[PDB]
Every structure is written in C-alpha cells, then in structure tokens.
Design a protein around this ligand. Structure first.
Ligand SMILES: Nc1ncnc2c1ncn2[C@@H]1O[C@H](COP(=O)(O)OP(=O)(O)O)[C@@H](O)[C@H]1O
Ligand SMILES: Nc1ncnc2c1ncn2[C@@H]1O[C@H](COP(=O)(O)OP(=O)(O)O)[C@@H](O)[C@H]1O
Ligand SMILES: [Mg+2]
Ligand SMILES: [Mg+2]
Lengths: 97, 524, 97, 150, 150, 75, 75
C-alpha cells in the first residue's frame, strides 16, 4: 500500500550515500556522511496554521529536493523501502534544469 | 664492586673445574646406556631428565671462577638445542674434550691463538667431510629410526613420528601434549580447523555430540564485529531463498545481532551458526582471508570500504560440510579451486622465507598446513607426572631430530661419523706447528662421544674406540647389543645437521675458552 | 544542473578565507577564520508566513552580501562547487558602490 | 643460586635416606594394626591421622638431597590417592621396596636402565594377573566388606 | 605575543620605511609567529623574532637595557600600553643584527651616549646596594654588555 | 607544511616531487633516482656539509652524516 | 682485527662503495659468514601504512614507476 502524509508533511525518498564521483575521476570512499537530496513521493494538502484557509505546498509529487536532514524528519518503511517524512519547513530547494 | 682478577694457569685451572662440573653432570646421560639426572625445583616435585640442555642450564657454581667456566661451556649445550633440539650432550662432551686437550697444550707453551686457528681449520674440514658422508633419509623406515634412536631406543615413538610425518605430509605440523591415559596416541585432523566454538549453544542441531553440523553451507566472512542485524538482512534472505544453511565467521557476534540470529535459527527459519574469527590482531584478517580462499568467498571488511548489506550470495564462501564444538570450528572440503588454493599457498610459502623472526614463523607454517596438508597431534602417555615430563620431552626431542634428518640427512651414530671424519683429516695441517697441534687437539676430541657412549655402558672406551677405528665406513659399535656392525643397517642413525651442530658449537666456544689468560669477576 | 531555493531560502557562494591584504601591505596568514561575504546565486519566491500573500526577497540574483554565518546556514555541492543555503533572515547587508 | 651437584652412589645414598624418612613415617600406618601419626600445624591443634597421603605431603627434609628423595617418592602416595582415594600407604611401601632392592642392584653393577625395563615388564604382567584374579563385587554384603576394610 | 592583530599598525609603518625589523618580546608563540614567518618568507617585510633575555624580574629591566642602547621604548602592558598604539618612533634601531640557533647580537645602537652613559651610571649603584652575591653577578654582566665587553 | 601557511588543497602537480621508481616493504621505503638536478642536490649537500662543522655535539653529528650519505654516496 | 684479512677486505670494500661521506655500521649476521650490504642511494625506515597498497605480493612489497611524490609535513 502507499502513503498519505497529513497536511504540510511531505513524503520523500533518500539518494546516494556519497555517490562515488565527487571531485572528478576519484571515487571518494564513504567518509561517514549521508545524502541530502531526495525524490518527493507524496504531498499533504498543506499547512493549516492561523485558522482562515489552508495553503498548498510548493513541492509537487516527483520533484527532486535538497532538504535539511535534522530532527523534523522521521524514518519509516513502505513495502520494505527507506522513506522519510518531514515537513516542507525542512525542504530547502529543488534541483531542476 | 671490587673484583677478583685471576691470571694464567691459575685462572684456567679454575675455569676447567668449572667446565668439568657441568660437563660431568651432562655426560651421565649420553647414549642408550644413559642414566638420568635429578634437578631440584623450589616450585614442586623435582624433575628427572636425560636431556643434556636441561641438566646444563641448572649448573651454577659457588666459586665465581669455576662458575664462569661453567656458564661458558653452558652455551654449547644451549645453542646446540636452539639449532636442532638434540645433540646437546654430545656437543657438551666435545667441548669438554676440546678444552681439556687444548688447555693441556697451552701448558706445553703453545700459542693459544694458533691452537684455536687449527682447531677451527680442523673443524671446517670436518664439516665438509660430514656433508660428504651424509645420505638422504627419506623413506618412512629411516625416519622411524631417527625418531627411535632419539627417543633413547623407543621404537614406538619412532613409529608414531614416522606415521604422522606420513599423514600430515611435508608441510604439516606435528605437536606433542600430555595424554589422558597410559599409552601414546596420534590424532590427525583432516584439512582446515581452528579454535572457535559456537557463540550460543542454541545453534547446536546435534545435542548427542554437543556440536553443530551443516551441509553445503554458505560462509559469511566478516572482518568486523557484528552488533546490528540490519546489516545482515539483505544477505540472510538471499540465503533463505537458496535453501542452504549459513556459517558466520566474523570478528565477533555480540548481544543484539546474535540474540536475533539465535531466535531466527531456532524457529526453523534459516539454518545458521556463528563463531569468532581465528586469533586476534593482524593475523586474524590475513587468516580469515585463508578461509575465504579455501571456500571461494570474499572477505567483507570496512577497511576496503565495504558494507555487509551490499553483499550478494556470490561473496559468500561455500563448503560441503561444517562441524563446530564448544571451542572448535572445522570446515570440510571447500569449493575453492586448487588453482587459487595452490596460489595462496605459494604466497605464504615466501612469508616464511622473509619471516625474519622465530615467532612470526610458527604461525605461517601453521596456516600452510591448514590450507595444504594436515595437522597432527601426539599424546604421550604416563602413569605419573615425573614420567609424563621425561617421556613427553623425549617424543618432543625426536620429533625434532626427524625434522632434521629430513632436511639434512643421516650419518652413522655411536659417534662413528665423527671418528671417521677424524681419520679423513689425519693429513690436515696449518700454517705452523702450534696450529698442527691445534688440529690434532680437535681430531682427538672427535673421539669423545663414542668414548662416553661406551663408558656409560661400563666397558672400556679405548678398546671400543680402537676396534671401531680399525674398521671402515659405517662400522661401529652397537652399545645396546654390545656388538659391532654396520650402523646404518642396524638403524643407528644420527641426523647429519645435529652431528654437525655439536661439532660447530662445541668448537666455537671451546675455541675461545682455551685462549683465556685473565679472568675478572666479583669478590666472594 | 542548477538549484531552486524554496521560498525565503537564498543560495549564495562564499568568498576568500582571509584575503591576504588586510591592514595594508601585510599578507595576514590564515588566523583560523572564515569569510562572511558571498555572491547570491538563487532566490526563493519569498517568505509565506502569516497566510495572506507572499512577500518577495530584497536580495537579487547576483548581489554581493554580508551574511551571518551560523546555524541557519547549510553546506551543499553543485556540479562540485561550495555553495551555502541560508534564509534572508541571515543576510545582513549588501556590499555595493 | 649456586648448586651442589652429587654423583652416583653418593647421590643415591642421600636419595635413599630421603625415601626412607618419608616411607617410614607412612608405614607406621599400614593395616588394621596400623598406628597413627601426628602432623603439627602452625594453624591450630595438630592432626592425628592414619592416612598415608596425609602423612606423606608433610615430609620435607633438611638435607637438600635427602629431600629430593622424599619429594620424589611422595608423588606415588599422591597419585595413588587422586586415582582411587585409597591404597596410598601400600603404594608408598611398594616403592620404598622397589627402590631399596633396585639400588642394591645398581651397586651390583647392573645397568639401571635395564633394571627399569625388567621392573616394568614384571609390572605390566602383574597387572594382567590382577585383572584375572579380580571377581566382580556387586552384592550389598561385599560392598559393605570393602567399606569396612577401608 | 599571540595575536598578529596587535602588530599590524606597526609592521606596516615599517613596510613603508623599507627597513627590516627585530622583535624581542617575552615570547612569540604559534598564531603570531606562524604569520610572521609567512610574511617574512614571501618577501613582504624583512623580520626576525627572538625570546627576551633571562626570566622573572631582570627580563624587564634587561629588556630596558636593550631599549636604551638602541634608543627605543619598551612596550609593556604594565604602564598600560598596547602594541597597536606604537608608531615607528617607539622602535629601537641599530646598524646591524646577528642571530644564531641560540645567540642574538645587536651591533652599534642608535642610542646617544648621553643616555647610554646615564643608564650605566644607574646600574653603577645597583652593585653598590646589591646586598647579595648572586644579585651582584648579573648587574656586572649587564654593565659590560652596555659599556665594555664580555 | 602548515608552518609556512600552506594548504594541501592549494597544491598543483608542480609542487610534487618525482622519481623513476620507488620500493616499499613492511618497514622500508626507498626512492630510486630523483628528478632533482644535481645543481640543487649538490647545493643542499654543501649546506649539510657545514651542519657537521658547527654540530657542537656527538649525537647531533651522527644524523647529519647519515643524511649526507642518503643524499650523496651510499649507506 | 687481530690479523683477520677478511675484515680488512670488507672494510676496504665498503669504504670504496659508500664513498668518503658514507656511513658504515656493523650488526649481528644471520649465518656463519660475514656479509656486506650496500644500499644504493636514498632509503629510510618506513613501511606502507596499509598492506593493501602492495601491488607485488611475491616480495610482500610495493613498487611504482615514474611516480609523483607528495610531501606533507603534517598528519
Ligand atoms: N645402540 C646404540 N649404540 C651406540 N650409540 C647409540 C645407540 N643408540 C643411540 N646411540 C647414540 O646416542 C648418541 C646420542 O644420544 P643422546 O644421549 O641424546 O645424546 P644427545 O643429547 O647428545 O642427543 C647418538 O650419537 C646416537 O648415535
Ligand atoms: N584383618 C586384616 N588382615 C590383613 N590385612 C588387612 C586386614 N584388614 C585390612 N587389611 C588390609 O589393609 C591393607 C591396607 O590398609 P591401609 O592401612 O588403609 O593401607 P592403605 O592406605 O594403603 O589403604 C589392605 O591391604 C587390606 O587388605
Ligand atoms: Mg639425543
Ligand atoms: Mg586404606
């Protein structure tokens, strides 16, 4: 089954644990560090705060995103796959172009 | 401290009483009619032994000068033994002989530095002569004969040694340890096995042995401690699909991981077992590599930047069966092609060549055996502890002499080889007369071991030596049967390397010693 | 590829680790200190806070800025180049003239 | 430490007095007309015992050589006991006996290593003999007899 | 001297006069030194640095000697002074200096012999009221380093 | 070295030494035939020449003579 | 060497190869005969930091040709 994040929470999936390429030709062996990029899988209707109306989120289903990996984020398992649940407050940018 | 200095014949005389008290305690044990010495111990019961270097190490004298004597000839017996673990009494006997004679000529007023030069020349010459009499010892019978003769004429030791040498092959280790009962017993473990038990007694699928057994199992070699089960999952499940059991040899398996493994094997999920890695420190990783090779698996260490999770079935080693006890894992018949087996063996071949140490040598030879031949254990039997000690020592002793025979050949025992090289050098001479006496001094000592063998039988050394000297080749005196004959045919073989080390070491120190003119030491 | 900061976040690049000149003729060797100046590479639409409307940011693409280097700021890598992601809350001034 | 080395008959004589002091303390206790020995104790009251390996463990001698004598025979009594917990006196008695007689034969000019081989041969043969005389003890009455005689 | 900040106003007044500079301080540690070392290396300003003579109380008095000989002003935080507030004028000067692995030496200081002779006439009476034997040795040393020779 | 205020990062190929071959064991590195012109070799040797002249000690003398040999002749 | 022609010769021989600014040291030998080692050019007492670098396991040692050399005076 798939997931449905509650208003303002966003469901994303992590990317590569130090993709062995950085710098150029040199395949940097894992230096004890994690990835901050991720694919957005689902979106909550949007933040309700301050009563009057409910604003959408500025990320769509399937965007590529740099987030801030911190306390806001949680680790979960869907069909046995590594997925994260943070709020848009934690999403920083979108890698495009 | 203030010193007591002693000069010429005076210092020598004391030196020689010194050599003598030692030499005599050592002699009593020489040859088949050897007798035993008892060496006391503040520890516990005394020690009864026949073993020259054991007696020698104990001798220490009260006369500071006599003591110097003794503490110096003591080294022939000591080196003799580090060099071929046998011949140490003979060694002793030749030095007491090179000294006695040598000194007597310094009293005649020869120049001891030349006495020495001739004694060495004599000796360099004798060593060549030995290499020339030496004939290879390579059948199982001869090997038994060296063992037997080394073990004061214990035919059973000869045999057992010969037997082991046969099964573990040429690159196999043989070790001796106390036995349980009264009779000697030879164990031969087949192929590869190390000192590690299951990490939980729950893995045990056969309680009647108290031991674990798996057939056609994959082998997970992890060069790292295992705490999180997460690290395992991708793997454990690839194995559950192939329907085969799994051995886990990691640096260790602790609480969290182990517990779960234990829970998983229990419920009949996947047949698994786990056991610590062999040894510690640096060799672990190299030795775990051995296991990789034997079973055609890939070591998974965080050193090459690897993760357990990223390991398919392919990385796993494999074998036909494994057997693990309370403290012993053993892998039977690994999948590794002998192309790769033989290769990894050809590497640890030269590990020993450039092992500049004695302890860095033992381990490598062990591994070679666990990968090539087999490992054998002898258990010495004895009624008592006074008995186990002396017997065990002899087996040990002969274990050595056979290893020496095999690499350097055999010559006629009963001191015959030496008595024969002595007539071959009847014509050796040096740069000057003093050196000529010095030569003659050694050739004469070369008679010593046959002369003591005989005297230990309570017959007359100079009658025996005369008749032996009157013969040829390998004619010699069988002290045990009190009859003459061919010593090779009668199985009285000395390993050449020992007869030669006896000569080398005894002359090397006797040589120096007879050139003492002053001696300095402490006040009483 | 290039980056697209999420509303209110700003993407800037750092400048010289103690440019050896300060004081005058003397080339002050690194004293264990970093730069606070930087070039603005991308801009988020702007802060959404308090529902009603969405105000732009007062920094443009390509400004030179003094920011406050602190917790608000994160370190990232684009095509293999050292870029930082703080919000306008952390930008203090603009060096002009 | 500097050592005292002793050779042949000299060393054996000492060796034997050694065996003897020990053997004789242990003997007084053999059999139903056994007597007791008293072994002192810096601890508390002395100990009166009939038990050969108890007496044997105490004997240590002042002559370092007589002592080696005693510390050697002392293991027969000791092993005998780890092996069946009984018969330690007898064992001691037999050794003092093998030694006395044997040394006498070394003085005759026999070759001790053979004296030994003959003693052992004699023994391996005796042990077979014993297994032959042995009849099982399996009723309650016989068990009580071994108990009792012990 | 730990912070190079303390130096800058000065080091730069010297870079403008185009002359090299000796630094005799109580010590020159990591942070400051390193940077001085980097600055002298690149051909920026010719500089050198060396510990002050002796320790404790005489250091300050003896560093004062050095001031006098070269006509400079001691910069200590005791009179409430800061390195930063020091123009070229405060600096001593000489015609040449020579320093080894463990020996600094100043050749011919700018100090007028009016002030030299005076400071010498002071340490003249230091010895007169030096009520000790060890407090006498050092003073005579200094007198020689400022007047005659060693 | 961080002593002249230098960073590894700011090092082009040019800073790197070079040789024709190198051989290293369990406890022995050895450089064969370095690219350094004997102009600079001979010079640095003419410096450690006078290190020994003013080596006022016996132990500060051993090491210098060692280095001279590793740079000039042989050991 | 109390009339030991062989010592004379070995010394003479070493003196000749390491040249005038070369060290000669004596240490215990493995066998019975004297032996003279002469190391050519520059070499010091340092092994690889990981046995993995080893591109030639038969020697148990590392070998590189025309390599650049990074000299870092810092951990
Ligand atoms: N029947 C025999 N006749 C003569 N010599 C024998 C006989 N058996 C063994 N030997 C000789 O015993 C000598 C050494 O035995 P051993 O007492 O251990 O002296 P070591 O400690 O010097 O090995 C060997 O030279 C061997 O030839
Ligand atoms: N009435 C008896 N007549 C003869 N021997 C006896 C008698 N009772 C016991 N024994 C013997 O006593 C001997 C040993 O008793 P003990 O003094 O304990 O010696 P140990 O310590 O050697 O056991 C045994 O040989 C046993 O046969
Ligand atoms: Mg022997
Ligand atoms: Mg009883």
């Amino acid at each position: 089954m798939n997931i449905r994040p509650l208003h303002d929470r966003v469901i994303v999936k992590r990317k590569e644990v130090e993709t062995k390429s950085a710098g150029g030709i040199v395949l940097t062996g894992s230096a004890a560090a994690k990835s901050t990029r991720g694919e957005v899988l689902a979106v909550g209707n949007g933040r309700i705060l301050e009563n009057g109306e409910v604003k959408p989120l500025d990320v769509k289903v399937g965007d590529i995103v740099i987030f801030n990996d911190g306390y806001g984020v949680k680790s979960e398992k869907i069909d046995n796959e590594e997925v994260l649940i943070m709020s848009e407050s934690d999403i920083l940018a979108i890698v495009e172009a | 401290a203030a010193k007591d200095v002693k000069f010429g014949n005076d210092a020598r005389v004391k030196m020689l009483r010194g050599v003598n008290v030692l030499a005599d305690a050592v002699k009593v044990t020489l040859g088949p009619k050897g007798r035993n010495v008892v060496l006391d111990k503040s520890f516990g019961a005394p020690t009864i032994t026949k073993d020259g270097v054991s007696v020698a190490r104990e001798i220490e004298l009260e006369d500071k000068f006599e003591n110097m004597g003794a503490q110096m000839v003591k080294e022939v017996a000591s080196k003799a033994n580090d060099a071929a673990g046998d011949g140490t009494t003979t060694a002793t006997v030749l030095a007491q002989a090179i000294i006695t004679e040598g000194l007597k000529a310094v009293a005649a007023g020869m120049n001891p530095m030349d006495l020495k030069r001739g004694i060495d020349k004599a000796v360099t010459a004798a060593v060549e002569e030995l290499k020339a009499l030496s004939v290879p010892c390579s059948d199982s019978k001869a090997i038994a004969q060296v063992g037997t003769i080394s073990a004061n004429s214990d035919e059973t030791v000869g045999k057992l040694i010969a037997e082991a040498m046969d099964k573990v092959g040429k690159e196999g280790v043989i070790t001796v340890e106390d036995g349980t009962g009264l009779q000697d017993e030879l164990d031969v473990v087949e192929g590869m096995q190390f000192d590690r038990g299951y990490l939980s007694p729950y893995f045990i699928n056969k309680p009647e042995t108290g031991a674990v057994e798996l057939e056609s199992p994959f082998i997970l070699l992890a060069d790292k401690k295992i705490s999180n089960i997460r690290e395992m999952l991708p793997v454990l499940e690839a194995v559950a699909k192939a329907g085969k059991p799994l051995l886990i040899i990691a640096e260790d398996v602790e609480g969290e991981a182990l517990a779960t493994l234990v829970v998983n094997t229990m419920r009949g999920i996947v047949k698994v077992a786990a056991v610590k890695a062999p040894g510690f420190g640096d060799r672990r990783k190299a030795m775990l590599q051995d296991i990789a090779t034997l079973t055609g698996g890939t070591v998974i260490s965080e050193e090459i930047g690897m993760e357990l999770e990223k390991a398919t079935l392919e990385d796993l080693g494999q074998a036909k069966r494994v057997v693990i006890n309370k403290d012993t894992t053993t892998i039977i018949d690994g999948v590794g092609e002998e192309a790769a087996i033989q290769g990894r063996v050809a590497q640890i071949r030269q590990q020993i060549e450039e092992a500049t140490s004695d302890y860095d040598r033992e381990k490598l030879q062990e591994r070679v055996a666990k990968l090539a031949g087999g490992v054998a254990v002898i258990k010495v039997g004895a009624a008592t502890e006074v008995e186990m000690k002396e017997k065990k020592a002899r087996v040990e002793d002969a274990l050595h002499a056979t290893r020496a025979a095999v690499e350097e050949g055999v010559v006629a025992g009963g001191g015959v080889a030496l008595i024969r090289v002595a007539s071959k050098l009847a014509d050796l001479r040096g740069q000057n007369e003093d050196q000529n006496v010095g030569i003659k001094v050694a050739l004469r000592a070369m008679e010593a071991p046959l002369r003591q063998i005989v005297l230990n039988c309570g017959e007359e050394p100079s009658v025996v030596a005369n008749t032996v000297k009157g013969g040829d080749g390998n004619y010699g005196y069988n002290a045990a049967t009190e009859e003459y004959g061919n010593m090779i045919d009668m199985g009285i073989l000395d390993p050449t390397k020992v007869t030669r080390s006896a000569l080398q070491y005894a002359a090397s120190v006797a040589g120096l010693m007879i050139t003492t003119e002053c001696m300095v030491t402490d006040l009483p």
